[PDB]
Paper text:
We determined the structure of full-length, human TRPV3T96A, hereafter simply referred to as TRPV3, in the closed apo state to ~3.4 Å using cryo-electron microscopy (cryo-EM). Extensive screening of various TRPV3 homologs and mutants identified human TRPV3 containing the point mutation T96A as optimal for structural studies. Characterization of both T96A and wild-type channels confirmed that the T96A mutation did not significantly alter the ligand-dependent gating profile of the TRPV3 channel. Third, we previously proposed that the presence of π-helices in the strategically important S4−S5 linker and S6 in TRPV channels likely acts as transient flexible hinge points that facilitate channel gating. Indeed, apo TRPV3 possesses a π-helix in the S4−S5 linker, whereas S6 is fully α-helical. In the apo structure, where the S6 helix is entirely α-helical, two pairs of interactions are present between S6 and the S4−S5 linker: one between residue N671 in S6 and the backbone carbonyl of Y575 located in the S4−S5 linker, and the other between the hydroxyl group of Y575 and the backbone amide of M672 within S6. Together, these interactions between S6 and the S4−S5 linker stabilize a straight, α-helical conformation of S6. Second, the selectivity filter (SF, residues 636–640) of TRPV3 is lined with backbone carbonyls, whereas the SFs of TRPV1 and TRPV2 are occluded by hydrophobic amino acid side-chains, such as methionine. Similarly to the SF in TRPV4, the TRPV3 SF is sufficiently wide (~7 Å) to permeate a semi-hydrated calcium ion. First, the high quality of the TRPV3 EM density map has allowed us to build the most complete thermoTRPV CTD to date (residues 707–754), a region that was not well resolved in the cryo-EM structures of TRPV1, TRPV2, or TRPV426–30. Notably, a thorough reanalysis of the apo TRPV3 datasets yielded no evidence of structural species containing symmetries lower than C4.
Author numbering:
A (entry chain A): 276 to 462, 480 to 508, 518 to 613, 620 to 754
B (entry chain B): 551 to 613, 620 to 688
C (entry chain B): 276 to 412
């Protein structure tokens, strides 16, 4: 009521920017925490103020950070208000120009809406699809990319160009790694054909990775692709140099390449969530187990090296004893009756305690795992996969030439209002629940 | 002849599908071997064929425990079960990298087995039973 | 209401087959996606049209694919409408002939119904039990 009173007066400046640069709408974007917290009253006010002043200026203006309130809603983690801003259907014909979703084809249960891609389709400086993907501070991007235009934009970009580029890059990497293996397994006329391509592609990956590593659990792989190419170029240098330490870095680069090919399993539909499971579990669940296992290794190692060194021997120096314990946890190290040992009963007891503690510790990593899997792990995997694909799609979107992006140019120019002339995205839908005589429609003949 | 034999004893699993209780069991075999395991198997084969050429590159320095490629792959498959006795690196250029690369194979195989178990646990609760 | 108006006129041909061969009932089978999606209004109309015209012809006729609307409901993945078609108990004695489920033995809480296996029991060219099993799509 008071907001209506304040809008009724001519002295009121609706478009007034504050010290921070925010008009009223930026502020309402700033406050809108969540649905359960607030009950979505901010959305109503966002509607009412724009319907009070029919203009594009309020959405046009920018704070001192240089962001439209759409872009501000994207920069901050505000999802419930973005679902409203990004798809508005204003019924009033006088203020119908301010809508961003237009129905042009409604015949009955079947109808196709028409979204506006003005500041959304990555054709501007920083669009919504760029911000919501490349912004790490949000921690809510799962619910951001499921919105009506963005989700379909990602599918369309994948169907048009990103699938082929991804498959093609995977193919080149596969050929490269096989050439590396064919070189290292047999180690000259074939090397002239192979090693040249190998060095060129290694330098290429190293340059790209060093370029993109300065601007930054999403960056791990991209940190590893650099180290591989470093090892490769180092080994190729030490091949012409006279040394024996070239094969070491070479085969380590090999094994690292076959470990890095796990990266490209992330683009597959079904195998992607699998690799995400590998990543999340190896990052969180296993790393807790590993250090607490290493500490027992290094305790019982000095223990057994203290006992069995009485008569210099099965368990010799510390390194050999630690190795024997690691042989034991797999089943490889044959359990020797205590010989050349001061006290055999304590020797055997201490070793059996190592076995039992390792067993219960393996048991607990399995336990925490069982607890992890049920709900959080599955949702986390799906979210990470979707986000990763989105990141890849926009990474390849910026590799293309200037003319190529204009060649693709998702969307079509529709005639809306007297002359909206805006790029739009058509989405066909079917709604059986609500039956409404279609009053507001753009095209009369449904094509 | 013997391949036909083993295939017949594998095909007799088909007729367990007519039983009341044992039928859903064989359906579980089929669905899991079709979906959950086949993802694990190829991604395991690729590590096999990477670390095989790796170890065949190292341990071929003095022609030997791990000989040609086929023998090295066989030794790795002996290792994942527990059969292949871990040999201290001998007739090898650099033993520390040899041992490190092998322990990395062990750890990666372990976490990969772990993840097939994980995706499995996620699969079993509701969808797997109804599907069976 | 409009469907009742259109059935009231003598000029209306209820049994008219379209270009694809479908009468009105085949169409209603074509549209009936799911309960949550539609809320099962199609089932009501399937009932109302048959009770408006008491005949077996509409179920008898076939589209150009050579399928009765029972067989069409089986060929497509339409389950909620098939549960209705496959067990109908019409209470009206004049149109009681059009029912496919008959109760003949009711004494109290105990009763035995009696289903019709005319096009269902694999005694025909392609019965419902054949289609629903051998159809992978």
């Amino acid at each position: 009521e008071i907001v209506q009173l304040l809008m009724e007066h001519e002295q009121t400046d609706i478009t007034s920017r504050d010290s921070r640069g925010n008009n009223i709408l930026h502020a309402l974007v700033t406050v809108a925490e969540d649905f359960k917290t607030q009950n979505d009253f901010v959305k109503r006010m966002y509607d009412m103020i724009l319907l009070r002043s029919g203009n594009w200026e309020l959405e046009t203006t920018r704070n001192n950070d240089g962001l439209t309130p759409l872009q501000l809603a994207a920069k901050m983690g505000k999802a419930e208000i973005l679902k409203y801003i990004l798809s508005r259907e204003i019924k009033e014909k006088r203020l119908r120009s301010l809508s961003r979703k237009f129905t042009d084809w409604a015949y009955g249960p079947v109808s196709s809406s028409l979204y506006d891609l003005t500041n959304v389709d990555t054709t501007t400086d920083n669009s919504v699809l760029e911000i919501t993907v490349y912004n790490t501070n949000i921690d809510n991007r799962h619910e951001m990319l499921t919105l009506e235009p963005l989700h379909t934009l990602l599918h369309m970009k994948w169907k048009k160009f990103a699938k082929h580029m991804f498959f093609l890059s995977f193919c080149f990497y596969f050929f490269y790694n096989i050439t590396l293996t064919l070189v290292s397994y047999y180690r000259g006329w074939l090397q002239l054909l192979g090693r040249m391509f190998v060095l060129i592609w290694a330098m290429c990956i190293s340059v790209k990775e060093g370029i993109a590593i300065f601007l930054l659990s999403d960056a791990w792989f991209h940190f590893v692709f650099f180290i591989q190419a470093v090892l490769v170029i180092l080994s190729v240098f030490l091949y012409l140099f006279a040394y024996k330490e070239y094969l070491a870095c070479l085969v380590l680069a090999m094994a690292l390449g076959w470990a890095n090919m796990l990266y490209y399993t992330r683009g597959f539909q079904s195998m992607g969530m699998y690799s995400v499971m590998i990543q999340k579990v190896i990052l969180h669940d296993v790393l807790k187990f590993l250090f607490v296992y290493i500490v027992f290794l290094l305790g019982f190692g000095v223990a057994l090296a203290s006992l069995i060194e009485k008569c210099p021997s099965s368990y010799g120096s510390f390194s050999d004893a630690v190795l024997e314990l690691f042989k034991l946890t797999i089943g490889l190290g044959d359990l020797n009756i205590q010989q050349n040992s001061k006290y055999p009963i304590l020797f055997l007891f201490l070793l059996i305690t190592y076995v039992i503690l390792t067993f219960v510790l393996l048991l607990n990593m399995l336990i925490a795992l069982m607890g992890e899997t049920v709900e959080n792990v599955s949702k986390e995997s799906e979210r990470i996969w979707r986000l990763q694909r989105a990141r890849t799609i926009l990474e390849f979107e910026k590799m293309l030439p200037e003319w190529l992006r204009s060649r693709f140019r998702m969307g079509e120019l529709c005639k809306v209002a007297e002359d909206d002339f805006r790029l739009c995205l058509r989405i066909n839908e079917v709604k059986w629940t609500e039956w409404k005589t279609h009053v507001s429609f753009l095209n009369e003949d449904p094509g």
